[PDB]
Amino acid sequence: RTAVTGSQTALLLRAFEKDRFPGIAAREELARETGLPESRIQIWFQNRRARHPG
Amino acid sequence: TAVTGSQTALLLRAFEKDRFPGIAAREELARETGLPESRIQIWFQNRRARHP
DNA sequence: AAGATTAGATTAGT
DNA sequence: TTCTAATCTAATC
Numbered sequence: 331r332t333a334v335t336g337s338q339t340a341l342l343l344r345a346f347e348k349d350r351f352p353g354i355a356a357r358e359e360l361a362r363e364t365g366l367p368e369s370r371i372q373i374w375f376q377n378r379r380a381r382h383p384g
Numbered sequence: 385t386a387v388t389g390s391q392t393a394l395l396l397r398a399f400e401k402d403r404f405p406g407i408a409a410r411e412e413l414a415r416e417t418g419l420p421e422s423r424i425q426i427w428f429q430n431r432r433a434r435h436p
Numbered sequence: 437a438a439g440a441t442t443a444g445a446t447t448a449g450t
Numbered sequence: 451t452t453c454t455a456a457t458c459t460a461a462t463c
């Protein structure tokens with residue numbers, strides 16, 4: 331539906347750099363923080379882990 | 385970077401017969417053109433968005 | 437222009 | 451059910 335902002339990006343990375351495989355509870359909280367659907371958060375983490383191993 | 389005139393000409397005949405070539409079709413084009421497989425796929429992706 | 441890359445998303449699946 | 455791996459589209463160096 332729309333590109334995400336810089337702040338939303340920064341927040342996901344800060345989370346990403348502490349819990350690379352956030353569980354559903356972690357993902358729902360990030361959803362509320364960012365104003366994104368939970369499904370889009372999951373996709374972000376899946377793609378990010380596939381694109382930045384180690 | 386930068387493909388030749390001949391390589392371009394060959395790709396269009398293929399594009400106009402198989403617009404979404406699978407790995408086997410794409411691998412054959414690599415040997416035909418002398419290009420890496422990854423660049424042919426990229427070529428097709430760009431061509432389909434710019435020349436449907 | 438046209439080649440290359442990035443992000444978001446979808447599908448298939450041991 | 452969540453994940454990986456390919457791969458597609460759209461948008462952009």
